[PDB]
């Protein structure tokens, strides 16, 4: 539909596998949990804890 651009560069074969990487909350905020074991998509999680 409009202009493109080939991009020819080096492509050596290289290992690839995910690992755990967890997000955190900057100083001054907090992360709220839903410790309920029945969490339908939305709705009040009747037990919340901070982490």
């Amino acid at each position, epitope marked *: 539909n409009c202009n493109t651009s*080939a991009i*020819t*560069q*080096a*492509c050596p074969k290289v290992s690839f596998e995910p690992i755990p990487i967890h997000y955190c909350a900057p100083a001054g905020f907090a992360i709220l949990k839903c410790k309920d074991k029945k969490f339908n998509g939305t709705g009040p999680c009747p037990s919340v804890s901070t982490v």
Partner: antibody, heavy 128, light 110 residues
Framework: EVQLVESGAEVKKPGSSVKVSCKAS????????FTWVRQAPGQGLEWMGR????????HYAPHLQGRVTITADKSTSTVYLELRNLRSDDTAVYFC?????????????????????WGQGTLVTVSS | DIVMTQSPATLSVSPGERATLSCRAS??????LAWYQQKPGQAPRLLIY???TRATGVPARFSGSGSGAEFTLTISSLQSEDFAVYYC???????????FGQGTRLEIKR
């Protein structure tokens, strides 16, 4: 299984533009990669470059880039080439080669580098 | 480029002897070479690809292979229909800006 037919010779001084056609017909055009190479009689050979048609992307030669155009028309599934800014010493026989590639429409594409088939012959008398 | 020190440069040869062309390289060239042939006043015709085995769908008397740069095209029995040139070509480099060669020019007994 697609055919390769080529063309003849033209007289122009260095600088002109000429259209040449390895008009390829006969069967499925998609499964094949296409490339060009020329040689003047008694000297080395000038390889043009490949055009990966299913993406419709080509390449060229380092010390020829700037005055060449190779096109692979998937719609008509033909081939065209437009040459410009020629030089007199380059009166050479031409050839169009190709290789069976694989199920591009299914994604498999080996992308090898040899030249399976060979063209017929095409001359560019860069002179008057 | 791949230093096609084609040995011998040109060979005026007869039918029926072990062909050994040496067009070696200067840089690491693993498994990519190519040999073709062209008859005087005729079209070129492929001989060997794969750089490790004979070409496919071809009359496979030839065995064009060897050790890295020292790759020999092997037709042990030359014939009356091989008075034609022989080539060396490489297709390695990436980013893709490929290369070519000049080959060798075989001739009849002169």
């Amino acid at each position: 299984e697609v055919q390769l037919v080529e063309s003849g010779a033209e007289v122009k001084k260095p600088g002109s533009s000429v259209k040449v056609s390895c008009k390829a017909s006969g069967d499925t055009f998609i499964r094949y990669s296409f490339t060009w190479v020329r040689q003047a009689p008694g000297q080395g050979l000038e390889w043009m470059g490949r055009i990966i048609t299913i993406l419709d992307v080509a390449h060229y030669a380092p010390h020829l880039q700037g005055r060449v155009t190779i096109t692979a028309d998937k719609s008509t599934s033909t081939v065209y080439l437009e040459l410009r800014n020629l030089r007199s010493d380059d009166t050479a026989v031409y050839f169009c080669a190709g290789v069976y590639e694989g199920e591009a429409d299914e994604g498999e594409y080996d992308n090898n580098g040899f030249l399976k088939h060979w063209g017929q012959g095409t001359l560019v008398t860069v002179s008057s | 480029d791949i230093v096609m020190t084609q040995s011998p440069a040109t060979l005026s040869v007869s039918p029926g002897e072990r062909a050994t062309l040496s067009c070696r390289a200067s840089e690491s060239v693993s498994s990519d070479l190519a040999w073709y042939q062209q008859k005087p006043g005729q079209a070129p015709r492929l001989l060997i690809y794969g750089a490790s085995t004979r070409a496919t769908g071809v009359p496979a008397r030839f065995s064009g292979s060897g050790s890295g740069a020292e790759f020999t095209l092997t037709i042990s029995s030359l014939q009356s229909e091989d008075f034609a040139v022989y080539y060396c070509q490489q297709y390695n480099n990436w980013p893709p800006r490929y290369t070519f060669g000049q080959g060798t020019r075989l001739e009849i007994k002169r």
